[PDB]
Every structure is written in structure tokens, then in C-alpha cells.
Amino acid sequence: MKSNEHDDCQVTNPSTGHLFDLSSLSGRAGFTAAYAKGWGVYMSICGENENCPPGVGACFGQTRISVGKANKRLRYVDQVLQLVYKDGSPCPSKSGLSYKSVISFVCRPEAGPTNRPMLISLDKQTCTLFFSWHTPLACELA
Numbered sequence: 001m002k003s004n005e006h007d008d009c010q011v012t013n014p015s016t017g018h019l020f021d022l023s024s025l026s027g028r029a030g031f032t033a034a035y036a037k038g039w040g041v042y043m044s045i046c047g048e049n050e051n052c053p054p055g056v057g058a059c060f061g062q063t064r065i066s067v068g069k070a071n072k073r074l075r076y077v078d079q080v081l082q083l084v085y086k087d088g089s090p091c092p093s094k095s096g097l098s099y100k101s102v103i104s105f106v107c108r109p110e111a112g113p114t115n116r117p118m119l120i121s122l123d124k125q126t127c128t129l130f131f132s133w134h135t136p137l138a139c140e141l142a
Contacts, residue, residue, distance in 0.1 A: 009046040067099040081105035107138035
């Protein structure tokens with residue numbers, strides 16, 4: 001029985017007692033970001049994506065190249081919440097490296113239409129896609 005999934009993605013700050021959770025942004029179908037070339041990036045915030053094989057959290061394109069295993073290690077570093085979807089498809093040109101997604105949730109209470117993952121840096125060399133998400137959920141109203 002699959003009723004033991006404890007996929008949290010939440011960090012508590014003892015100072016305020018405030019919990020930074022991304023449970024409200026978590027989705028099974030996730031978010032599909034259209035890449036300017038004709039590739040749909042299927043990325044689920046904390047979980048495995050419906051278009052992806054069970055266990056993969058982010059898939060790049062129609063060939064569904066895994067760009068991150070379903071990880072729930074939400075790190076709160078430098079007032080930014082960061083999710084790293086490590087262990088993707090081994091890069092054919094780079095031995096030891098795999099396509100990974102680094103989502104940087106910048107604490108922006110002044111969040112606008114930027115409440116979506118913005119592809120800030122595309123790194124082909126080490127196969128890392130940097131997505132910046134402007135969310136007030138990385139913030140503590142205190």
C-alpha cells in the first residue's frame with residue numbers, strides 16, 4: 001500500500017517558529033515550462049511528475065530526459081529556499097555528471113508574475129539548469 005509518502009519540503013526557523021513549506025506549490029502534474037526551442041520541461045515541485053517515470057521529479061522535453069530525481073531536501077540557505085533535483089540522466093559528453101535542476105526560491109514578498117520558475121542560467125557544461133522562483137513562501141512575515 002502506497003500510503004507512506006512523507007514528502008515534506010518544509011524548513012522551520014526556530015527564531016520565529018515559522019515554517020517555510022512549499023506544500024501549496026507541490027503538484028503531481030507540476031508546472032510545465034515551455035523552453036524557447038520547442039521543449040516542455042515537466043517539473044513538479046516536490047514529487048514525481050505525472051509525465052515522468054515514477055520517481056523522476058523533473059523531465060526535460062518530449063523524450064522526458066530526467067533532469068532530477070524526486071528530492072524533498074529543501075535547504076534554507078542565505079534566506080533562499082533551494083531545491084536541488086540531483087541525479088538526472090548521465091550527460092553523454094560528461095562522465096560523472098547528470099542533468100540536474102537547481103531551483104532557487106528567492107524570498108520576494110514583493111512577488112509579481114515571477115511566481116513561476118524563471119530559467120536564469122542554462123548550464124550545458126555541468127548540465128545544470130538554474131530556475132529562480134519568486135515566492136513569498138520563502139519569507140517569514142514577522
